[PDB]
Amino acid sequence: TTVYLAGDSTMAKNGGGSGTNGWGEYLASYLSATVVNDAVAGRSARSYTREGRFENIADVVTAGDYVIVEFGHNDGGSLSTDNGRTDCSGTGAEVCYSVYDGVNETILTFPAYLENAAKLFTAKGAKVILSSQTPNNPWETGTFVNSPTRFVEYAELAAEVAGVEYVDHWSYVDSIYETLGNATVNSYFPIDHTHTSPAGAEVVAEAFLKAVVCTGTSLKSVLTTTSFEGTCL
Ligand SMILES: *[C@@H]1O[C@H](CO)[C@@H](O)[C@H](O)[C@H]1NC(C)=O
Ligand SMILES: *[C@@H]1O[C@H](CO)[C@@H](O)[C@H](O)[C@H]1NC(C)=O
């Protein structure tokens, strides 16, 4: 069995560079399946879709395989000065137009991008798991602040609509981030408040596996152990 990872710099190998790393790099050792980390730094649901990265996964995925999709960090911004990643506002069939890189592009909503990808993978017999984005350093201000982005809910909404599984990666990460405290968590974010140090990337990975176990996600079948930190919910 093979597990494919689609995400951004918080999941990708080498994370955001400069000694940071993505959480996808710490799954292999707890799974009895091959893990392919196709996350790329700086990608949004739109950017990733347009670059044909979802297709590359669809071409190679075989029945029974797993696909984990997690975006959000790069999905915001303004289309006035299109950065190529910003999705169209809304949660449904909304459609935005914008000239990016010399092409009048048809831009969809965040849920729409995830839903289309989910359907594409389901069609190939693969098991799809949409995951909410990881949180930016909540202990950045010296005090713990829990303020999810709109993309956390949008991911849950996309899963329902597409009829696939959802894992609240956000909540499980923030949960232990709160337990770990100011000093510890802040060391996970050397450079900025998004890109985690290798030590932090591991914790974020553990958080995901804790969510899988607690919610009963199908991926638990290939878990080599169920002894992870924190408590359920
Ligand atoms: C892009 O296409 C839409 C609909 O086809 C059109 O209304 C819009 O004006 C186009 N954008 C530009 C900059 O031409
Ligand atoms: C939190 O930790 C940072 C970095 O370790 C430190 O500089 C800061 O003073 C701490 N803030 C509080 C309120 O404890």
Tab-separated table of C-alpha atoms and ligand atoms in Angstrom:
chain	number	residue	atom	x	y	z
A	1	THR	CA	0.000	0.000	0.000
A	2	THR	CA	1.073	3.586	-0.679
A	3	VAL	CA	0.262	6.833	1.164
A	4	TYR	CA	0.491	10.045	-0.829
A	5	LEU	CA	0.831	13.442	0.812
A	6	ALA	CA	-0.378	16.626	-0.844
A	7	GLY	CA	0.311	19.838	1.025
A	8	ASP	CA	2.476	22.933	1.390
A	9	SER	CA	5.699	23.971	3.186
A	10	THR	CA	4.373	22.809	6.540
A	11	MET	CA	4.211	19.246	5.231
A	12	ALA	CA	6.912	19.224	2.552
A	13	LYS	CA	10.454	17.856	2.772
A	14	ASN	CA	12.809	20.623	3.949
A	15	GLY	CA	9.717	22.597	4.991
A	16	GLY	CA	10.337	26.227	4.213
A	17	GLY	CA	14.084	25.666	3.852
A	18	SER	CA	16.820	27.075	6.123
A	19	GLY	CA	16.725	24.072	8.457
A	20	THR	CA	12.953	23.759	8.910
A	21	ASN	CA	10.978	20.680	7.920
A	22	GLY	CA	7.485	19.455	7.076
A	23	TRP	CA	5.434	17.035	9.138
A	24	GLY	CA	5.059	14.577	6.274
A	25	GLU	CA	8.671	13.588	6.838
A	26	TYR	CA	7.867	11.938	10.153
A	27	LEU	CA	5.177	9.414	9.212
A	28	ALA	CA	7.127	6.592	7.586
A	29	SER	CA	8.304	5.041	10.876
A	30	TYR	CA	4.781	4.572	12.272
A	31	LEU	CA	3.200	3.192	9.117
A	32	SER	CA	3.547	-0.209	7.478
A	33	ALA	CA	3.069	1.375	4.039
A	34	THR	CA	5.254	3.405	1.680
A	35	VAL	CA	4.916	7.139	2.208
A	36	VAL	CA	5.386	9.521	-0.711
A	37	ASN	CA	5.617	13.148	0.299
A	38	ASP	CA	4.402	15.209	-2.658
A	39	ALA	CA	3.906	18.404	-0.635
A	40	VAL	CA	5.531	21.471	-2.158
A	41	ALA	CA	6.450	24.737	-0.491
A	42	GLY	CA	4.269	27.722	-1.316
A	43	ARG	CA	1.311	25.824	-2.767
A	44	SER	CA	-2.382	26.504	-2.319
A	45	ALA	CA	-5.325	24.350	-3.429
A	46	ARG	CA	-5.469	26.523	-6.553
A	47	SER	CA	-1.703	26.631	-7.256
A	48	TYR	CA	-1.351	22.875	-6.657
A	49	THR	CA	-4.309	22.124	-8.955
A	50	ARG	CA	-3.139	24.414	-11.785
A	51	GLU	CA	0.417	23.036	-11.660
A	52	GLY	CA	-0.995	19.580	-12.351
A	53	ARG	CA	0.221	18.199	-9.045
A	54	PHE	CA	-3.083	16.558	-8.151
A	55	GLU	CA	-3.031	14.841	-11.580
A	56	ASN	CA	0.474	13.438	-11.028
A	57	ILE	CA	-0.832	11.688	-7.930
A	58	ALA	CA	-3.973	10.475	-9.708
A	59	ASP	CA	-1.908	8.963	-12.537
A	60	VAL	CA	0.120	6.763	-10.158
A	61	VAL	CA	-2.403	5.989	-7.395
A	62	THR	CA	-3.673	2.399	-7.392
A	63	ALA	CA	-6.809	1.010	-5.695
A	64	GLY	CA	-6.480	0.701	-1.921
A	65	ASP	CA	-3.903	3.521	-1.672
A	66	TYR	CA	-4.267	6.580	0.582
A	67	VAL	CA	-4.174	10.282	-0.252
A	68	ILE	CA	-3.900	12.946	2.441
A	69	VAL	CA	-4.636	16.510	1.387
A	70	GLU	CA	-3.906	19.493	3.617
A	71	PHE	CA	-3.840	23.131	2.468
A	72	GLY	CA	-4.787	26.515	3.843
A	73	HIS	CA	-1.646	28.461	4.708
A	74	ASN	CA	-1.222	29.850	1.190
A	75	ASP	CA	-4.888	30.055	0.165
A	76	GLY	CA	-5.602	33.609	1.298
A	77	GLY	CA	-4.639	37.024	-0.004
A	78	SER	CA	-6.059	39.411	-2.579
A	79	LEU	CA	-6.785	38.881	-6.272
A	80	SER	CA	-6.167	42.595	-7.008
A	81	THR	CA	-2.484	41.636	-7.083
A	82	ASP	CA	-2.912	37.970	-7.868
A	83	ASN	CA	-0.038	35.963	-6.385
A	84	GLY	CA	-1.221	32.851	-8.198
A	85	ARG	CA	-2.303	31.063	-5.033
A	86	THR	CA	-5.283	32.954	-3.646
A	87	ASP	CA	-8.535	31.004	-4.063
A	88	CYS	CA	-11.913	32.588	-4.855
A	89	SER	CA	-13.909	33.587	-1.772
A	90	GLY	CA	-16.857	31.479	-0.710
A	91	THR	CA	-17.491	27.803	-0.030
A	92	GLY	CA	-19.423	26.643	-3.083
A	93	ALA	CA	-19.777	27.064	-6.827
A	94	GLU	CA	-18.410	30.615	-6.707
A	95	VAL	CA	-16.056	31.349	-9.601
A	96	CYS	CA	-13.522	34.189	-9.853
A	97	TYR	CA	-11.666	35.423	-12.925
A	98	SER	CA	-8.160	36.882	-12.994
A	99	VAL	CA	-5.250	37.238	-15.386
A	100	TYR	CA	-2.286	35.457	-13.861
A	101	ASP	CA	0.931	34.846	-15.771
A	102	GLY	CA	-0.726	36.041	-18.974
A	103	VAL	CA	-3.784	33.732	-18.872
A	104	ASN	CA	-7.389	34.601	-17.949
A	105	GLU	CA	-7.722	31.974	-15.236
A	106	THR	CA	-10.920	30.471	-13.882
A	107	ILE	CA	-10.456	30.392	-10.106
A	108	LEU	CA	-12.639	28.279	-7.822
A	109	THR	CA	-13.305	28.243	-4.104
A	110	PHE	CA	-11.176	26.407	-1.588
A	111	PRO	CA	-13.777	23.664	-0.950
A	112	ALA	CA	-14.376	23.261	-4.689
A	113	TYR	CA	-10.679	22.561	-5.349
A	114	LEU	CA	-10.523	19.946	-2.582
A	115	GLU	CA	-13.828	18.368	-3.647
A	116	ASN	CA	-12.709	17.953	-7.277
A	117	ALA	CA	-9.423	16.392	-6.182
A	118	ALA	CA	-11.240	14.070	-3.765
A	119	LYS	CA	-13.620	12.847	-6.519
A	120	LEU	CA	-10.661	12.281	-8.836
A	121	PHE	CA	-8.865	10.063	-6.325
A	122	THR	CA	-12.016	8.214	-5.290
A	123	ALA	CA	-12.597	7.393	-8.958
A	124	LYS	CA	-9.226	5.573	-8.982
A	125	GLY	CA	-10.152	3.482	-5.937
A	126	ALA	CA	-7.924	5.402	-3.542
A	127	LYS	CA	-9.000	6.335	0.003
A	128	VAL	CA	-9.067	10.128	0.505
A	129	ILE	CA	-8.400	11.982	3.750
A	130	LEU	CA	-8.791	15.776	3.816
A	131	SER	CA	-7.011	17.405	6.751
A	132	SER	CA	-7.357	20.859	8.287
A	133	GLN	CA	-4.259	23.089	8.118
A	134	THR	CA	-1.752	23.217	10.950
A	135	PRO	CA	-1.771	26.312	13.198
A	136	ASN	CA	0.747	29.150	13.154
A	137	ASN	CA	2.644	29.616	16.437
A	138	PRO	CA	-0.171	30.178	18.998
A	139	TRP	CA	2.348	31.124	21.705
A	140	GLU	CA	3.790	33.868	19.510
A	141	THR	CA	2.406	36.644	21.701
A	142	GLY	CA	3.656	35.014	24.907
A	143	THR	CA	0.077	33.949	25.648
A	144	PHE	CA	-1.808	31.011	24.081
A	145	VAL	CA	-4.290	32.104	21.416
A	146	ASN	CA	-6.625	29.728	19.612
A	147	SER	CA	-7.869	31.402	16.439
A	148	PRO	CA	-8.505	29.035	13.509
A	149	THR	CA	-8.541	30.317	9.954
A	150	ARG	CA	-11.588	29.934	7.734
A	151	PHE	CA	-9.813	27.078	5.919
A	152	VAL	CA	-10.135	24.763	8.901
A	153	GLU	CA	-13.931	24.693	8.598
A	154	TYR	CA	-13.767	24.735	4.773
A	155	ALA	CA	-11.801	21.491	4.859
A	156	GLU	CA	-14.424	19.810	7.060
A	157	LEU	CA	-17.174	21.143	4.794
A	158	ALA	CA	-15.356	19.860	1.692
A	159	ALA	CA	-15.075	16.359	3.178
A	160	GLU	CA	-18.820	16.125	3.907
A	161	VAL	CA	-19.773	17.289	0.428
A	162	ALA	CA	-17.300	14.934	-1.290
A	163	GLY	CA	-18.166	12.073	1.052
A	164	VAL	CA	-14.593	11.412	2.203
A	165	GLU	CA	-12.824	11.303	5.567
A	166	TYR	CA	-11.789	14.344	7.554
A	167	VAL	CA	-9.115	14.723	10.212
A	168	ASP	CA	-9.022	17.880	12.336
A	169	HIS	CA	-5.244	18.258	12.304
A	170	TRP	CA	-5.558	21.876	13.477
A	171	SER	CA	-7.254	21.083	16.791
A	172	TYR	CA	-4.959	18.212	17.676
A	173	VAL	CA	-1.875	20.319	17.060
A	174	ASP	CA	-3.115	23.299	19.038
A	175	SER	CA	-4.172	20.957	21.824
A	176	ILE	CA	-0.635	19.740	22.581
A	177	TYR	CA	0.835	23.131	21.736
A	178	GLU	CA	-1.176	24.396	24.696
A	179	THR	CA	0.132	21.602	26.945
A	180	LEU	CA	3.774	22.212	25.929
A	181	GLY	CA	3.802	25.886	26.927
A	182	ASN	CA	5.407	29.162	25.821
A	183	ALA	CA	9.134	28.299	26.026
A	184	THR	CA	8.910	24.917	24.301
A	185	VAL	CA	6.580	25.793	21.447
A	186	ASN	CA	8.479	28.974	20.591
A	187	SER	CA	11.624	26.924	19.942
A	188	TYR	CA	9.680	25.100	17.201
A	189	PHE	CA	9.501	28.367	15.250
A	190	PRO	CA	13.038	29.726	14.785
A	191	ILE	CA	12.602	31.993	11.740
A	192	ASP	CA	8.866	32.750	11.377
A	193	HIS	CA	5.514	31.693	12.872
A	194	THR	CA	4.651	29.137	10.154
A	195	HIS	CA	7.680	26.991	9.369
A	196	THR	CA	8.482	24.456	12.113
A	197	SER	CA	11.906	23.178	13.174
A	198	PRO	CA	12.542	19.450	12.729
A	199	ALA	CA	11.631	18.949	16.391
A	200	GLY	CA	8.337	20.769	15.859
A	201	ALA	CA	7.550	18.991	12.602
A	202	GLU	CA	7.671	15.676	14.493
A	203	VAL	CA	5.186	16.815	17.131
A	204	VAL	CA	2.846	18.057	14.400
A	205	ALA	CA	3.128	14.612	12.751
A	206	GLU	CA	2.387	12.855	16.061
A	207	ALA	CA	-0.606	15.140	16.437
A	208	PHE	CA	-1.960	13.885	13.118
A	209	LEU	CA	-1.580	10.243	14.078
A	210	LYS	CA	-3.291	10.963	17.417
A	211	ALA	CA	-6.219	12.443	15.499
A	212	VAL	CA	-6.370	9.403	13.179
A	213	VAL	CA	-6.530	7.016	16.121
A	214	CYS	CA	-9.051	9.137	18.067
A	215	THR	CA	-11.445	9.764	15.190
A	216	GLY	CA	-11.153	6.239	13.831
A	217	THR	CA	-9.868	7.250	10.405
A	218	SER	CA	-9.421	4.344	7.951
A	219	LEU	CA	-5.674	4.947	7.895
A	220	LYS	CA	-5.446	3.355	11.351
A	221	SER	CA	-5.342	-0.049	9.618
A	222	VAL	CA	-1.710	0.550	8.591
A	223	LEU	CA	-0.517	1.995	11.920
A	224	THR	CA	2.316	0.026	13.567
A	225	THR	CA	1.491	1.452	17.018
A	226	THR	CA	-1.190	3.497	18.787
A	227	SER	CA	0.891	4.979	21.613
A	228	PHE	CA	0.843	8.727	20.853
A	229	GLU	CA	0.866	11.824	23.091
A	230	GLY	CA	-2.128	13.874	24.214
A	231	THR	CA	-5.766	12.869	24.729
A	232	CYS	CA	-8.700	12.529	22.282
A	233	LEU	CA	-10.568	15.588	20.984
B	1	LIG	C1	-12.036	36.368	-18.173
B	1	LIG	O1	-13.205	35.615	-18.622
B	1	LIG	C2	-14.461	36.108	-18.048
B	1	LIG	C3	-15.583	35.186	-18.504
B	1	LIG	O2	-15.181	34.407	-19.642
B	1	LIG	C4	-14.704	37.538	-18.509
B	1	LIG	O3	-15.962	38.029	-18.014
B	1	LIG	C5	-13.570	38.395	-17.970
B	1	LIG	O4	-13.753	39.738	-18.426
B	1	LIG	C6	-12.218	37.866	-18.468
B	1	LIG	N1	-11.164	38.639	-17.824
B	1	LIG	C7	-10.446	39.508	-18.547
B	1	LIG	C8	-9.367	40.307	-17.803
B	1	LIG	O5	-10.584	39.648	-19.792
B	2	LIG	C1	8.080	33.098	25.909
B	2	LIG	O1	9.266	32.501	25.340
B	2	LIG	C2	10.047	33.452	24.572
B	2	LIG	C3	11.084	32.659	23.786
B	2	LIG	O2	11.467	31.476	24.500
B	2	LIG	C4	10.662	34.474	25.540
B	2	LIG	O3	11.573	35.369	24.852
B	2	LIG	C5	9.488	35.250	26.169
B	2	LIG	O4	10.000	36.179	27.144
B	2	LIG	C6	8.463	34.289	26.845
B	2	LIG	N1	7.280	35.081	27.182
B	2	LIG	C7	6.614	34.880	28.331
B	2	LIG	C8	5.387	35.772	28.574
B	2	LIG	O5	6.929	34.003	29.181
